[PDB]
Amino acid sequence: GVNLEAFSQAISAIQALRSSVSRVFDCLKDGMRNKETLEGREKAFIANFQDNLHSVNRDLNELERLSNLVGKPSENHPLHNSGLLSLDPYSQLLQAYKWSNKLQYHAGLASGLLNQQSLKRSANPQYVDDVISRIDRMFPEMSIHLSRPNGTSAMLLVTLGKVLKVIVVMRSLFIDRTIVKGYNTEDGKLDIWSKSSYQVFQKVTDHATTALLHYQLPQMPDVVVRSFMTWLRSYIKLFQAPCQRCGKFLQDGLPPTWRDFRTLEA
Amino acid sequence: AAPGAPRPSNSTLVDELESSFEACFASLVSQDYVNGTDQEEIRTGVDQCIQKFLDIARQTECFFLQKRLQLSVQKPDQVIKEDVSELRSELQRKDALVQKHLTKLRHWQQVLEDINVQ
Amino acid sequence: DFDPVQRYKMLIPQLKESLQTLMKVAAQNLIQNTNIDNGQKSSDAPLQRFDKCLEEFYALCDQLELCLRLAHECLSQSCDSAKHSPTLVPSLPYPQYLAVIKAQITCAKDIHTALLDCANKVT
Amino acid sequence: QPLLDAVLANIRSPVFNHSLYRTFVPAMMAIHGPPIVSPVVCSRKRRFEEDERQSIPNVLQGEVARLDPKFLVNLDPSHCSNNGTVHLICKLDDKDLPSVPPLELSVPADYPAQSPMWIDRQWQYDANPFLQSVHRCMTSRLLQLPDKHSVTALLNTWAQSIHQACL
Amino acid sequence: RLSGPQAFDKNEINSIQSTEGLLEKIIKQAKHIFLRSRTAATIDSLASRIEDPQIQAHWSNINDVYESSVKVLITSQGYEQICKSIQLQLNIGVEQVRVVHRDGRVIMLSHQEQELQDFLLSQMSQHQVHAVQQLAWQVLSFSNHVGLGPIESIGNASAITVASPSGDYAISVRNGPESGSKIMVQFPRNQCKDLPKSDVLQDSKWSHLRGPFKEVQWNKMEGRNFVYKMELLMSALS
Amino acid sequence: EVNTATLCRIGQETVQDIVYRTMEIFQLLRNMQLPNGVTYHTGTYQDRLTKLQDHLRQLSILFRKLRLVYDKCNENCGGMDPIPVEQLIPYERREIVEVNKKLKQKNQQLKQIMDQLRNLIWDINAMLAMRN
C-alpha cells in the first residue's frame, strides 16, 4: 500500500507539466531582450522544451505505477454519509482522523527535535522485565528467551539466524555485561563466562560493551532495550565494508551509525 | 521597517517565552476546518516552534547565570549559606540512608539466625 | 462508470496527442503570421485558432489532475480508517460500529478541547 | 519529438519582433486574466556612488587584519599608492629577542607572487654575529616556500627562522 | 565420545580435561589481589582528585571465579548530561584489565599503570566543557585529541584543545595531565592596542575580528569543579 | 531571609523542568492512538488523559512559579548598580569549615562501611558460584 507516494508524485508531475507549458508560452511571448553579441534566447527555448519533454516522460513513467484501484468502498468508511440519511444529519469522523494524524506526526517531529533537551542535571520491579523481553522478542528473526538462574539477574540469550548466540546478562534494568559466542553455548546447565571466539567475536563483544555503555539513557529503559535490539539486528548480514575493502582485516564490523564497515577505521 | 537601524523590543523574556509557548501550539488547536492533507508543513512549523523556544529558554538561563554572577560578586554570604544548607541536607540524607541500611542488615541478621536452625 | 486508474490510462494518450496537435497548430499559426508580416504572401489558406486547442489541452490536464486527486483522497481516507476498525458490511454489527465511531469522535474532540483550554489558560 | 516550434523559432532570424506578440498574447490574456500580473512598482536609479577613494588593495587589508598582536606593520615613505601598495616595517615584537624589521614590498594583492624585498640586508646583518646567523638559515627556508603569501606566510616564516636560529 | 559426530580438531580434544589443583587457587589469589589493588587505586584517585570531576565507579553483582566486571563513569559534579566518558573494564586473573573508554578503544593495562585514568579525566573535562558549550554557544566540533603542544605533553599526551564562540567573543581552553590543565583564554573583538596604519585605509573599519588574546587568568574565579565554564560563558550578552 | 542565590537556582531548575515537561508531554502525545482502536475502550485512554492533565497542570504551576521568581528577582535589584560582572571578570566561615570536617569524617566512615559491604558481596557472589 505505497500508492500514496506514487499518486503524490503523479500530481506533482502533472502540476509541473502545466507549469512548464505556461513557462514555455510565457517566454515565447518575449524575444531576445538584450544580447548584443548573439541571440542566447535559443538556449533558454531549448531548455524549456527539454523540460517539457522531461515532464512528459515523468508522467509516462508514473503511468507505469498505480497498478490497480482495489474495491472495498473506502474500507468501512460509509456509515452515515452513504448510509442512513438520518445518521448523516458526519464530517466529525473525518476531521477527527485528520486531526489525529496531524497531532501524531507533529508530536513525533517535536520529540525528535527536542531530544537535545537542555536538562542541567538530576538534582533539586521484577514484573515488567518479562513483558519488555516478550515485546522485544516479538520482532522477527530475533528468537530470545530469559532464564534467570541466579537471583533477579536476567541472564537472557539471543540468536538471530546463525549459531552466533549472545548471552547478554541484565540487572532488571540497564542490561550490561554481555558476551558473544558463535557455534557453541551453555555448559553444564547454565550460561558461562567463556567468551571464547576466533579473534573476531572478541571485537564484537568489545563493540557490544561499547554500545551498552553508549545507550545509557536517564530514563525509559524499554526504549533503551528496543534501540539495543534494533542495533544488534544489523549484524545479520556482515556483507558490507565502506571506506575500505571487504577483507582489510580478519573481521569487519562497527555499525553505531547504522552502516557496518571494517574495524580500525573509526 | 524593522530590518533597518531601529528595533523596538520591550517587556519580554518572560511573557515572550509564555507567548511563544502558547502560540506555537496553534498548529494543533484551532476552531477551523483541518484540511485533508499534511506534508512538509507541520515539519517547518514545529521547527520554528522549537527553535525560538529553545533560544528564549537559553536566553533566560543566561540571564539567571548573569544574576548569579552579580550576586556572587556582590554578596557571597548568600552563597556560603546555600553551601551550608546543602551540606546539612547531604548529611541528613547520608544519615537516613545509613539508618535504613542498618535496619535492613539487622533484619537480615535475625532472618539468618532464625533460618540456620538446621 | 470506470475506475480512476482506467480514466487516467485513457486520458494520458489523448493528453499526449493534444500536446502534439497544440505544438503543430502553434508552429503553423506562427509561420503563417511571420510570412504574412515579414515576407511575401505565401500562406493563403485558413489556419486553425490555436486557442480552441490550448483550452482543450488545459481542460484535459485539469481533468486528469482532478481524477488523480480524487483517487488519492479516496485511497488516503480508506487507508487510515482501515487500520482503525475491522471490515463488516454486506464481523461486526452496524449499530456497534456507529456507536464506536461516535465515541471515538467524542473522545478526540474532548482531548483537543482539553488541550486547547489548558494552552489558553497557560497564558 | 514536437520540434516544429523549435525549428520555427530558430528559423525566425529577422529583426522585426511583433509576430510572436500578436500570435500568442491574445490567447494568454484570454486564459490568464491579470490586469497587473506584477503589481509591484519598479522605478530605479540604481547607482548613486560607490567608492571610498582611500582604499589600498583590500586583499592586503584582510591579511593585516588577520595578523597576531605580536606583529605590527606600518608604511614608510610610500611608492605604494595602488600598484606596489606595500613596503612595510614589521617589527617582530614577541617574547624572544628582537631584531631589525624588513621591508617586504609585495606585488598587486591578487598575489601571483610573494613579497620578499631584503633591503636592509647590507649593514644590519653583517654587523652582528647573531643577526648574521639569522639571515643564513632564514634565506634557505624562504627558498623553500612554494608561492609564499605576503603578510601572514612570510612574516610567520621570518619569526620562526628568527626564533629557530636563536637555538 | 562427542568428538565422533562433532569432530573437533583441537578445541574439545583439549577442553575435555585440563590441569587443576594448585594452579586454580593461585589464579584465584592473583585475581583477588588484582581486584584489591584496582579498588585501592580507584579509591586513592577519588580521594586525591577532589576539586577535579569526582570519579564515579559502580561494581557488578556477577563476580565469576576468574574474571569479574567493573563499571565507572566520570560524572562531573552536579551534571548528569556531561557523561561523555564512561568505561567498563574487566579485571581478569592471569592477565591485566581490558578497558574500553567509549568508542571501542580497547587497551590492556599493567600492574601499576593508572595514568590512563588521569588522561581520561583530562579529556573528560574537555568533553564536558564541549558539551556544556553545545548546550548553552556556537561550539564547533574541533575538540581534537591533542595538537602542537601547549606544555610539552608530560603525562601521556593529555592535552585538550577546544574553542567556542558564543556571540562576537570566543573562548578556548586547553587542559592536560595536571601540566597546565587550567589554560583558558578568551579573546574579545575590540581592545586598546591597535594599528591604524593599514586598518584606517580599510573601508568599513574592521572592529568585528578578534585578535588580542587577553588570557582569562584563572585565579579566584568561581569554578567549583571545572563544570562552571558556562558560569563564565554566560558573560556574553545581557 | 534573602536566599536570592537559591532563588536563581530554583528559577533555572524551573526553566529546565518546563523544557523537560514539554518534551515529556510531546513524547506522550506521540504514542496516543485512536481511543476505540482495538480493545482499550477507555482504561488506557482515561489513564493517558489523566496523565496529560496532571502534566499540563504541573506545567501551569511551573509557569506561575517562574513568573513569581522572575518578579522577585527583578524587584530584588539592590546594590552593585553598574554590575559589569558580565564584562568585568578577571582577565560564618568557621561553621562552614566545621561542617566540611564533619562531612569528611562521615564520608570516611561511609567508605569504611562500603569496603566491608563490597567485600561481603564479592565473597558471597564468588562462593555461591563455585557450588556443584
Tab-separated table of C-alpha atoms in Angstrom, chain C residues 19-20 23-24 26-27 29-31 33-34 37-38 50-51 54-55 58, chain D residues 1-2 4-5 8 12 14 16 18-20 22-24 27-28 31-32:
chain	number	residue	atom	x	y	z
C	19	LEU	CA	0.015	18.336	-26.794
C	20	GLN	CA	1.349	17.269	-30.196
C	23	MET	CA	2.607	22.297	-30.880
C	24	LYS	CA	1.690	21.715	-34.529
C	26	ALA	CA	1.201	26.839	-32.771
C	27	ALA	CA	4.004	26.327	-35.294
C	29	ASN	CA	-0.019	29.819	-36.919
C	30	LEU	CA	3.374	31.335	-36.118
C	31	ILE	CA	4.865	30.607	-39.545
C	33	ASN	CA	1.819	35.145	-39.181
C	34	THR	CA	5.519	35.613	-39.943
C	37	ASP	CA	4.018	40.079	-41.587
C	38	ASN	CA	7.686	39.781	-42.660
C	50	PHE	CA	-4.554	27.689	-31.638
C	51	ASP	CA	-6.804	28.773	-28.761
C	54	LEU	CA	-4.755	25.088	-25.880
C	55	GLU	CA	-8.037	25.448	-23.991
C	58	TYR	CA	-5.651	22.649	-20.371
D	1	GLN	CA	9.528	14.999	-30.782
D	2	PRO	CA	7.395	18.145	-31.373
D	4	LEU	CA	8.148	22.178	-35.047
D	5	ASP	CA	8.046	25.169	-32.696
D	8	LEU	CA	10.399	27.682	-36.468
D	12	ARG	CA	12.802	33.269	-37.220
D	14	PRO	CA	14.553	38.635	-38.936
D	16	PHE	CA	11.029	42.501	-36.665
D	18	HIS	CA	5.885	41.655	-33.370
D	19	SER	CA	4.509	38.413	-34.844
D	20	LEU	CA	5.048	36.456	-31.621
D	22	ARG	CA	0.119	39.186	-31.987
D	23	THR	CA	0.205	35.375	-32.229
D	24	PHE	CA	0.435	34.427	-28.534
D	27	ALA	CA	-4.591	33.590	-26.032
D	28	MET	CA	-2.655	34.146	-22.803
D	31	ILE	CA	-6.962	32.480	-20.405
D	32	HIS	CA	-4.811	34.240	-17.814
